[PDB]
Design a protein around this ligand. Structure first.
Ligand SMILES: *[C@@H]1O[C@H](CO)[C@@H](O)[C@H](O)[C@H]1NC(C)=O
Ligand SMILES: *[C@@H]1O[C@H](CO)[C@@H](O)[C@H](O)[C@H]1NC(C)=O
Lengths: 212, 213, 233
């Protein structure tokens, strides 16, 4: 039986868009049906990297499962996690992606972040994350308490450091900020390490699967 | 610009009151509300749209509409009597912070109480310092309107009188004090001194005498 | 979390410079926070003074901008306020508070568009005057078998002729807090203040429990612990 996404797309579903809330997944499917491009699936404007390839590897899976890669109540103690935005509202109440956490400063500080995950699920683990780009420099310091920010994502088959670029932009869905979404596949036994001092849209929920 | 609010409003206990604050800075940023009890620091009761800090009862709710922000207290209680201030940041210029004028909320329907009056004579230590003060302490009365009169023997006295304006105690009732300053010779040359406390047309009088303990 | 405590002189001469200090504990002063000052003249409303963000960024009240200077000292984990050319209009209770960071663009979470001050200090009373500081004279208000009211009796302390405000009174070093009322102060013709603190007490304890009022007058660095005994007649 195919994965039925109903009135929303693959981007909003895999990210946990509050309008695709509920929409319980399955363990297996041979194809996906969807209504594409409701504001390109991202309630917060941005760029989805390698989006065509992700859809290709999500076409046919056999052992799909959604788990918590970094629990909210731990993992991020010295940071605040309850960040929401009006662009991602649910029932007229501001919310955020059910699978990501907009980490910002807690008690005025954003300490050096470092969290790792080992793929002990004996399958491939799909990890989604993001990087945020404020529109002015004043808001960058108020949100992350740093003018120069880095986000390090390191695994055995993936390694990249993102530097946020601050620039003025038009209002897309009422927002002048952007969030670029990235992902990578973690083979069984591999370790992925997230290091950051700001602008990280940290992974909250991930996915383990086969045939992908 | 500036935030304006009415200086005083009253609500009967158990009912609901809405404290309104108006200004041109309310459309830019969200308004916040504070509660200030007498002699205490302000405490934040509402920020953002309708978010209350931890430990603030759900009786306090906040709404905004245009250039107007409102604080609603459903089911008012005696503990809600305080001064309430609105507060917002301007969305233009260097973003200065402006406070409302403040609103004094009075909770009506509380039980009335006759004042309790305690009159202290000058202590022997103050007398041996060649000074004399009579201390009239008035407490546990509601409403908080009271008039004090002193008497030497049976004659009214107005020289050397100082009376505090009433203030609510931790009981929610009002208290006030009155001092009569004298010389030790004036104190000893009379037969008695009296503190006369009038509250709601009735009067309580206490008397002290230098010849008695 | 973070706690704030003001400190400074309670008396400043006219045309002088007020100078106050707020100590931040349980947190770093070099953080994403707008450390603010607020004052309150007697019987008047709150007035915002100014705010500071580490990096030198200061934002002051327009009506106070000329006389106000807010700085920060990272070594002592504190931020200060200095107000020059003080007059009677500057007599007030001064508070130091904490305001959260905020954004000026649509690129931040929703919680960064609210203004508030959630953490407040306890307040420091500053009086603009040329008169000298004077410590108080404490006298006991003993209980009397005529002025009792059955099972309970009232005793207290007279705190006479101090300047400036304020004076705090506790009983038995804070171990006695129930039945305690400290009345507001009178301002006599001499320009000196006086107040009383009374506590209602069970009558059968007058001869066996010791009652000591603790007077504190920080403007003159004076502490008095006055014993209140029953009248020996
Ligand atoms: C979209 O939602 C509406 C209302 O919930 C429903 O009638 C419609 O069938 C949904 N779309 C699909 C493809 O089922
Ligand atoms: C955090 O990491 C950055 C970059 O690795 C480093 O410069 C800094 O000293 C570290 N510590 C703090 C407290 O920022």
């Amino acid at each position: 039986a195919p994965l039925q996404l109903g009135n929303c797309s693959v981007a909003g579903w895999i990210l946990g868009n509050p309008e695709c809330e509920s929409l319980i997944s399955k363990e297996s499917w041979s194809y996906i049906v969807e209504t594409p491009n409701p504001e390109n699936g991202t309630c917060y404007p941005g760029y989805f990297a390698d989006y065509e390839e992700l859809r290709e590897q999500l076409s046919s899976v056999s052992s799909f499962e959604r788990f918590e890669i970094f629990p909210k109540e731990s993992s991020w103690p010295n940071h605040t996690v309850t960040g929401v935005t009006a662009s991602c509202s649910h029932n007229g109440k501001s919310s955020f992606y059910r699978n990501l956490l907009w980490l910002t400063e807690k008690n005025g500080l954003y300490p050096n972040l470092s969290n790792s995950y080992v793929n002990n699920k004996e399958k491939e683990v799909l990890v989604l994350w993001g990087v945020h780009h404020p529109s002015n420099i004043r808001d960058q310091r108020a949100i992350y308490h740093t003018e120069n920010a880095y986000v390090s994502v390191v695994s055995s088959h993936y390694s990249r450091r993102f530097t946020p670029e601050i620039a003025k932009r038009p209002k897309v869905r009422g927002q002048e900020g952007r969030i670029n979404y990235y992902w990578t596949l973690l083979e069984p036994g591999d370790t992925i390490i997230f290091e950051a001092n700001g602008n990280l849209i940290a992974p909250w929920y991930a996915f383990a699967l086969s045939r992908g | 610009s500036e935030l304006t609010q009415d200086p005083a409003v009253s609500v009967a206990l158990g009912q609901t009151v809405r404290i309104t604050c108006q200004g041109d800075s309310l459309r830019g940023y969200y308004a916040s509300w504070y509660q200030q009890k007498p002699g205490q620091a302000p405490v934040l009761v509402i920020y953002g749209k309708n978010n209350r800090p931890s430990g603030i009862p759900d009786r306090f709710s906040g709404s905004s509409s245009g250039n107007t922000a409102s604080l609603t207290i459903t089911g008012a209680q005696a503990e809600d009597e305080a001064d309430y201030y609105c507060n917002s940041r301007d969305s233009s210029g260097n973003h200065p912070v402006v406070f409302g004028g403040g609103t004094k909320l009075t909770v009506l329907g509380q039980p009335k109480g006759a004042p309790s009056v305690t009159l202290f004579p000058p202590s022997s230590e103050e007398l041996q310092a060649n000074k004399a003060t009579l201390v009239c302490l008035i407490s546990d009365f509601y409403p908080g309107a009271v008039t004090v009169a002193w008497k030497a023997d049976s004659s009214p006295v107005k020289a050397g009188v100082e009376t505090t304006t009433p203030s609510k105690q931790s009981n929610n009732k009002y208290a006030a004090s009155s001092y009569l300053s004298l010389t030790p010779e004036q104190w000893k040359s009379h037969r008695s001194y009296s503190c006369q406390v009038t509250h709601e047309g009735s009067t309580v009088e206490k008397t002290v005498a230098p010849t008695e303990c | 979390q973070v706690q704030l405590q003001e400190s400074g002189p309670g008396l400043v001469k006219p045309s002088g410079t007020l100078s106050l200090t707020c100590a931040v504990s349980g947190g770093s002063i070099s953080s994403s926070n707008w450390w603010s000052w607020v004052r309150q003249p007697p019987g008047k409303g709150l007035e915002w003074i100014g705010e500071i963000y580490h990096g030198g960024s200061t934002n002051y009240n327009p009506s106070l901008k000329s006389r106000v200077t807010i700085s920060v000292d990272k070594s002592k984990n504190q931020f200060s306020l200095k107000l020059s050319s003080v007059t009677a209009a500057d007599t007030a209770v001064y508070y130091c508070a904490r305001a959260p960071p905020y954004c000026t663009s649509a690129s931040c979470p929703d919680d960064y568009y609210y203004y508030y001050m959630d953490v407040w200090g306890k307040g420091t009373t500053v009086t603009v005057s040329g008169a000298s500081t004077k410590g108080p004279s404490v006298f006991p208000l003993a209980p009397s078998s005529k002025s009792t009211s059955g099972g309970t009796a009232a005793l207290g302390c007279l705190v006479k002729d101090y300047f400036p405000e304020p004076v705090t009174v506790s009983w038995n070093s804070g171990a006695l807090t129930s039945g305690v009322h400290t009345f507001p102060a009178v301002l006599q013709s001499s320009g000196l203040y006086s107040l009383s603190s009374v506590v209602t007490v069970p009558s059968s304890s007058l001869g066996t429990q010791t009652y000591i009022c603790n007077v504190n007058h920080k403007p003159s660095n004076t502490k008095v612990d006055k014993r209140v005994e029953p009248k020996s007649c």
